[PDB]
Structures are given as C-alpha cells and as structure tokens.
Design a protein around this ligand. Structure first.
Ligand SMILES: CC(=O)SCCNC(=O)CCNC(=O)[C@H](O)C(C)(C)COP(=O)(O)OP(=O)(O)OC[C@H]1O[C@@H](n2cnc3c(N)ncnc32)[C@H](O)[C@@H]1OP(=O)(O)O
Ligand SMILES: CC(=O)SCCNC(=O)CCNC(=O)[C@H](O)C(C)(C)COP(=O)(O)OP(=O)(O)OC[C@H]1O[C@@H](n2cnc3c(N)ncnc32)[C@H](O)[C@@H]1OP(=O)(O)O
Ligand code: NA
Ligand code: NA
Lengths: 184, 184
C-alpha cells in the first residue's frame, strides 16, 4: 500500500512533498525526529534498490550526510510514504559526438522510486514536476545516472526526452543538452 | 489492477493458471486467431517482466517460446470486482543442462528445473500471487524448491525464496545460475 513506518510521519513531514538536503533537517526532541528521518531515507534507499534490482542501495542517510544531494519525499495523504526522487549537481565528462570529453556540471537525477502499489498513477510525474520547478531546470538540461527502462519511457512520455549522443560513463543525456540543440 | 488486452482474456484462458509451451495451444474464434492473442499476451508479459527487473531487453517472448523447451504458467485475475479479464503475471521454467559447483567446488553435471523469468504486476505485488503461482508450478512439475536452479535471481526474488521456501544459503557458482544448500 505504501512504505509504512512505526511513527507519526504526518507530525514529522507536515507537507505532501518534503525537500531535504544533507542536513536532513526536521521541518519546522531534535534527536528523535532526526533519527526518524534517517530511518526513512535508509528504508527508501533499500526499497528503491529492490525496485530497480540493484545489489545494494545507492541512497542512504549516511550517503546523504556526506554528499550535496537533495531528496524530495512524497507522503501518502490517506502517514505512510509513497516515494522520493534524489537529485544533485555532479561533475561529469560528457562525450559530444565529435567524440571528445566535455567537463560539465549538470543537475543529475540520481535515484527515484514510487511504491509498487501506486506506480503508474502519476506520482512520479508529480514529484518530478515539483523538483523541476524548485530546481529551476529544464528537463533536457538533466543528466541521468543509470536510468532504468521504466525511467527512460517515463522521460520520453512526460517530457519528450529523446537520447542524444551515446555516453560511455553510464550517465544519459538528451537532445537539448548541447548548445546548438534548442528547438522549441 | 493488472494487464489488460483488447480481447476477451477470460474466454481465452478459462482457468486461473494456464500452462503453455512451444505449441501455444489455446485451452479447451479461429484457432490461429486465438494463438495470435496468446502470442500477444506472452510478448507483452515478457516486455513487462523485463521492465520490472530493469533488464535492457525481454527474455521472454512468443517467438522465443516457439523455439525452446520453456514452459509458462500464466495467472489471470480471478477477482470478483474488475470486463474482458486481466493477466496478473507468469512464471517461466525449463530444464537446462548445467555444470554446477558443489560445496567443495567440484563440478557436477546436472539437469535441474530452472526458474527463468517470473513477474507479478506491480499493482498487486506482495499480495501472495507470486507464491500461489510458484506453488502451482512446483506441484505440476513435481519438483521440490531446493532442487531448483535460478537464472540470475533479482533481489526481490532472493527475498521471496527465503521467505516462502527457506532458501537462503547459496552454493557459490561461477556462471550466473544460483542454487541453494540442499541441491545436492
Ligand atoms: C536515475 C534513477 O533513479 S533509475 C531508477 C528509476 N526507478 C525505478 O526504475 C524503480 C521502479 N519504478 C518506479 O519507481 C516508477 O515507475 C518511476 C519512478 C520510474 C516512475 O513513476 P510512476 O509513478 O511509475 O510514473 P507516472 O505514473 O508518473 O508515469 C507513468 C509513465 O512512466 C513509465 N512507466 C511507469 N511504469 C512503467 C512500466 N511498468 N513499464 C513501462 N513504463 C512505465 C511510462 O512512460 C508511463 O506512462 P504510460 O502508463 O502512459 O505508459
Ligand atoms: C529468475 C527470475 O525470474 S528473476 C526476476 C524476478 N522478477 C522480478 O524481480 C520482477 C519484479 N518482482 C515481481 O514480479 C514479484 O515481486 C515477484 C515475482 C518477485 C514475487 O511475487 P509477489 O507476488 O510479489 O510475491 P508474494 O506476494 O507471493 O511474496 C512476497 C515476498 O516476496 C518478496 N518481495 C516481494 N516484493 C518485494 C519488495 N518490493 N522488496 C523486497 N521483497 C519483496 C518478499 O520476500 C515478500 O515477502 P514480505 O512481504 O513478507 O517481505
Ligand atoms: Na518496481
Ligand atoms: Na517491479
């Protein structure tokens, strides 16, 4: 039904979408609340890894505390958690079809999960659209870290994103990423 | 929910679990028309299963079925609630000649029943459907769980096999199939 936790998620996350950074700050004891948030991030990371068939999580409280990632968490309004998306700027070398490496630092989509029970009901788009508005980035400016097959379809459906230059580094970028690509 | 199709699934598959092989025989319109419906169902299930396990391509399809010794057990929705019927998921199995290391790393030529592909629609995962389907297959195949080899098990599947059949400790292999203590 969702990710259920043995504590008052509503009290902790009063908003439907909660944005947290490396500080994992409780929305306005400090210690007990913050521990609850770390548990949520740990469990979300595990669930996302099971979903994408990863042998280990790529998102955790520990990894959040030591990076400059931003996580957007979607709460179930029916007290449980429905899913999240994690983003961050990363220094990448991107190939440009003259086959040269270009050092860039785009916003990257790093991890993304919606509970199986409510996948394909528009919640992924809900979070993605919120993140786009908050980060003030256009979808074609993004790089995606190891997109899943579901995510590739999602990006093409909602944002008309079509891959551009194939990459060797497991990031994916789309038409519009390069300066000469700006068709409306 | 479930997987829906532009034809009457309940008429095509009268039974809760339908077992099909390379012949793609309609269960007890024209014959070829019903076979086309079956092929469509197998193709679509294969694609869904690949998306579910984050595979870059389907490992199950009508054409692949027709040219192999694989057997598919397809579970239809039997709910009293949902008008053309719906498919919940499937499991595909086949005997394969394998060379498996035992617990002394000695090589053993075996031909176990292998679990090759397995998928339950996301909307109803974790509701016991996979267990029902797995158990039906074991009974019809007359195989015990520890006697199975698993092709490239996903993380969800490893948890599933431990929970339901107490299959947890593996005997390490060099070849991407997985077997459990007790196989020998
Ligand atoms: C960089 C990364 O994070 S890679 C990891 C991405 N995460 C995963 O793959 C985990 C499993 N999947 C999920 O958690 C979700 O499906 C997400 C996050 C990929 C998408 O969120 P949803 O809530 O499922 O998407 P939403 O309902 O908003 O959009 C639906 C669209 O996504 C795509 N999509 C979602 N599920 C599927 C599916 N099972 N098969 C194919 N495409 C799918 C389709 O384009 C679909 O549109 P359609 O129904 O018209 O075909
Ligand atoms: C050889 C191959 O086929 S590898 C590919 C296997 N297929 C996939 O990974 C595709 C996606 N997953 C699925 O289609 C299904 O989850 C299956 C086929 C693995 C299992 O079917 P379900 O109908 O989900 O199983 P069922 O409800 O019968 O059993 C539940 C158990 O499976 C495991 N399981 C199911 N979903 C999850 C999950 N999201 N995270 C961790 N474990 C899970 C758990 O052990 C769970 O028991 P629990 O709820 O007490 O923890
Ligand atoms: Na999933
Ligand atoms: Na899945």
């Amino acid at each position: 039904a969702s990710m259920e936790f043995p504590f008052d998620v509503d009290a902790l996350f009063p908003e439907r979408i909660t944005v947290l950074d490396q500080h994992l700050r409780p929305p306005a004891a400090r210690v007990d609340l913050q521990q609850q948030i770390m548990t949520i991030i740990d469990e979300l990371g595990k669930a996302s890894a099971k979903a994408a068939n990863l042998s280990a999580p790529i998102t955790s409280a520990s990894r959040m505390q030591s990076n400059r990632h931003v996580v957007y968490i979607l709460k179930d309004s029916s007290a449980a958690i429905i899913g999240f998306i994690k983003v961050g700027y990363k220094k990448l070398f991107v190939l440009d079809d003259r086959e040269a490496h270009n050092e860039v630092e785009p916003l990257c989509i790093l991890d993304f999960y919606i509970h199986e029970s409510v996948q394909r009901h528009g919640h992924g788009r809900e979070l993605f659209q919120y993140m786009l508005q908050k980060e003030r980035v256009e979808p074609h400016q993004l790089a995606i870290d190891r997109p899943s097959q579901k995510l590739l379809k999602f990006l093409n459906k909602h944002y008309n994103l079509e891959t551009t230059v194939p990459q060797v580094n497991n990031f994916v970028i789309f038409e519009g990423f390069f300066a000469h690509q700006h068709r409306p």
